[PDB]
Scaffold this active site. Structure first.
Site, PDB file in Angstrom:
ATOM      1  N   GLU A 234       0.815  -1.208   0.000  1.00  0.00           N
ATOM      2  CA  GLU A 234       0.000   0.000   0.000  1.00  0.00           C
ATOM      3  C   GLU A 234       0.851   1.262   0.000  1.00  0.00           C
ATOM      4  OE1 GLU A 234      -2.910  -0.996  -0.633  1.00  0.00           O
ATOM      5  OE2 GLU A 234      -3.045  -2.958   0.307  1.00  0.00           O
TER       6      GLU A 234
ATOM      7  N   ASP B 165      -1.625  -8.513  -9.078  1.00  0.00           N
ATOM      8  CA  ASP B 165      -1.255  -7.328  -9.844  1.00  0.00           C
ATOM      9  C   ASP B 165      -0.970  -7.674 -11.299  1.00  0.00           C
ATOM     10  OD1 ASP B 165      -1.296  -6.847  -7.183  1.00  0.00           O
ATOM     11  OD2 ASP B 165       0.720  -6.003  -7.045  1.00  0.00           O
TER      12      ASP B 165
END
Lengths: 215, 50, 386
Positions: free
Chosen positions: A97, A178
């Site tokens: 993050e 991802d």
């Protein structure tokens, strides 16, 4: 017709017409960042914000109680936190993050297409361990996908996995999701939208147009 | 006559619940029972054990 | 390979002995419990500077040492006050350096990171238990941990053999060794046995601390000049012939002697960590320690001697190697720096480590207090026992 933007502002002002609101809570940003929600959920969000302020032992200052009230119904419940035993999970579900927010800030520089980061949580609240919230820009910026916007979205997808890899010095399984998102976005970039240079002008002979949700 | 009445509506879905019953005076109380960890599991075994 | 100042005064030797332990404990503080392959990938440029972003259980602040160096400093100050080893004053100084703040939840939540056995021993001697009945409260778990080991062979730190055969006996014996350097060997052995009378009474912990203290004494005696005194093989032979009595300690020190290549001067730590020299060092370290964790006293002393002697003549490289070896990194780097300071005075400590020690949370006054403890350790006299 679900209320939105100005209607969401009117609903939030109606449900906050008898409660003190700190000036740091951006009502317009909160209304734009909660799309598709109705009064039958914004009433609960204001209710839980009020109860969190009451349980906090103070008045309704700061935006953290408002964000907790939003999170309690957008990402329901609160799971137990990540364990302090071993330095692996606290590092991974902070590095991903942090890297996403850092890449978002860097792409906000130079280009400016990437919206600002609202918050990063890393406290598990329902079906997830960490989050990065993006300050949803105004509509009419989402009604059209640009080549630079898609490139920035691919970069923001890859950012979390590559940040975990940069932190640990080691490849993990955090790059799998991802990669799964970025490959689909790159296929939409190359084939459907035709933003690439395939063939010398970017027009391929084949493109997978998406189907409707009615199927 | 809700004097002492209590309904436990066991919900295996946190994020899908009727918008009308989550208001005050209604089903607004929530309890996340977690999966036990090492300590808890052990105690469960000891309780069954004795 | 002889540093530079071929003759070092006793003041410089003792202040270097304190400061090497200081910089090792500060440098290797966030790498406690981590393994070497994890550490060399976390710090790809090498462990050459103090880390500011520890994120663990008790995040060590920038420039802060742990409870191992706190105990070493308390041992040095109490020994300088008492001109020897007196267990009552030693435990008084240890508890004074232990009860510096926390949260009484009553485990007291110590300000710095402490070993579990060290915390248990200090809590027992602060809970009215007399500091000679070790198994009365030190066999809490431990024996039950051995009974619980019957169906698991983990390398997890919770299953590390923490007890009377821990490394905390040998982590703080370097001040004792440097003070009893010229007072002979038998009196040094008696001083070490007096020092570990309340925490580590086992022969394994006694031999570990004896090896460490004797090495410290020896290092204090020889000077960084010609290879007649500057020889790791001679140090190992002296330790094996005079100090090593137990079987596992003897075997680890011979396993050191047989092996022990000399590490070249290293500039690119990223290239060194992917090199055959670091591969051989990690292979020998894995032979001398179980899964990178040298919790036992013999394994810990052998690892400390490996990190000190494999990079002979480069004490900074020794401290960096001991920090990057992982496992019990702060105590291992503290002992390696203490031995390197008993060898070489305060001239090899880089200005980056000096500024990091000074600019930390335990800085300025803390750094000069470490220097003053070194001064008192040099200036203390004992006249062969006092």
């Amino acid at each position: 017709p679900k209320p939105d933007t100005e209607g969401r502002l009117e609903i939030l002002k109606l449900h906050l017409r008898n409660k003190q609101v700190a000036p740091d809570v951006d009502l317009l940003q909160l209304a734009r960042d909660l799309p598709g929600l109705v009064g039958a959920d914004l009433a609960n969000i204001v209710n839980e914000a009020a109860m969190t302020a009451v349980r906090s032992g103070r008045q309704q200052l700061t935006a953290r109680d408002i964000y907790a009230g939003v999170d309690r119904f957008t990402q329901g419940e609160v799971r137990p936190s990540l364990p302090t035993a071993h330095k692996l999970p606290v590092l991974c579900f902070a590095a991903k993050e942090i890297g996403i927010a850092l890449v978002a800030g860097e792409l906000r520089d130079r280009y400016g297409r990437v919206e600002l980061v609202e918050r990063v949580s890393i406290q598990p609240k329902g079906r997830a361990y960490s989050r990065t919230m993006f300050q949803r820009g105004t509509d009419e910026e989402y009604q059209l996908m640009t080549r630079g916007r898609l490139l920035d979205r691919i970069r923001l997808a890859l950012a979390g996995g590559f940040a975990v890899r940069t932190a640990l010095g080691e490849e993990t399984n955090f790059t799998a999701a991802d990669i799964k998102r970025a490959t689909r976005m790159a296929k939409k970039y190359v084939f459907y939208y035709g933003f690439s240079e395939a063939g010398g002008a970017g027009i391929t002979t084949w493109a997978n147009q998406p189907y409707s949700g009615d199927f | 006559d809700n004097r002492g009445i209590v309904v436990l509506g066991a919900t295996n879905r946190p994020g899908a619940i009727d918008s009308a019953l989550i208001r005050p005076g209604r089903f607004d109380r929530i309890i996340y029972m977690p999966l036990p960890d090492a300590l808890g599991r052990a105690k469960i075994m000891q309780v069954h054990a004795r | 390979a002889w540093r530079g100042p071929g003759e070092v005064g006793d003041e410089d030797k003792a202040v270097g002995c304190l400061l090497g332990a200081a910089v090792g404990n500060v440098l290797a503080a966030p790498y406690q419990g981590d393994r070497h392959f994890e550490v060399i990938r976390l710090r790809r440029n090498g462990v050459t500077d103090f880390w500011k972003y520890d994120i663990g259980a008790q995040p060590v602040q920038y420039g802060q040492y742990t409870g191992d160096f706190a105990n070493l400093l308390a041992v040095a100050t109490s020994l300088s006050a008492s001109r020897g080893v007196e267990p009552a004053h030693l435990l008084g100084a240890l508890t004074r350096a232990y009860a510096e703040g926390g949260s009484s939840v009553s485990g007291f939540l110590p300000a710095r990171r402490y070993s579990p056995y060290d915390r248990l021993v200090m809590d027992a001697v602060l809970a009215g238990t007399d500091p000679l009945k070790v198994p009365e409260l030190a066999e809490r778990y431990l024996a039950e941990t051995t009974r619980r080991h019957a169906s698991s062979s983990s390398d997890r730190p919770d299953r590390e053999p923490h007890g009377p055969s821990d490394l905390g006996a040998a982590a703080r014996a370097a001040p004792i060794g440097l003070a009893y350097r010229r007072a002979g060997g038998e009196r040094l052995l008696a001083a070490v046995r007096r020092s570990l009378e309340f925490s580590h009474p086992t022969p394994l912990g006694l031999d570990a601390a004896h090896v460490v203290a004797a090495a410290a004494a020896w290092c204090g005696r020889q000077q960084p000049g010609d290879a007649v005194g500057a020889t790791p093989a001679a140090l190992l032979s002296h330790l094996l012939n005079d100090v090593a009595v137990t079987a596992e300690q003897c075997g680890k020190l011979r396993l050191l002697r047989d092996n022990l290549f000399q590490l070249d001067e290293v500039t690119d730590w990223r290239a060194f960590y992917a090199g055959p020299q670091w591969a051989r060092l990690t292979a020998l370290f894995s032979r001398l320690s179980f899964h990178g964790l040298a919790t036992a006293g013999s394994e810990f002393a052998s690892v400390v001697l490996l990190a000190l002697l494999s990079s002979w003549g480069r004490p900074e490289q020794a401290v960096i190697v001991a920090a990057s070896l992982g496992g019990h990194a702060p105590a291992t780097a503290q002992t390696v720096g203490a031995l390197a300071g008993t060898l070489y005075g305060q001239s090899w400590v880089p200005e980056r480590w000096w500024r990091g020690l000074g600019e930390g949370v335990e800085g300025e006054a803390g750094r000069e207090a470490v220097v003053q403890a070194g001064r008192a350790l040099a200036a203390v006299e004992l006249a062969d026992g006092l």
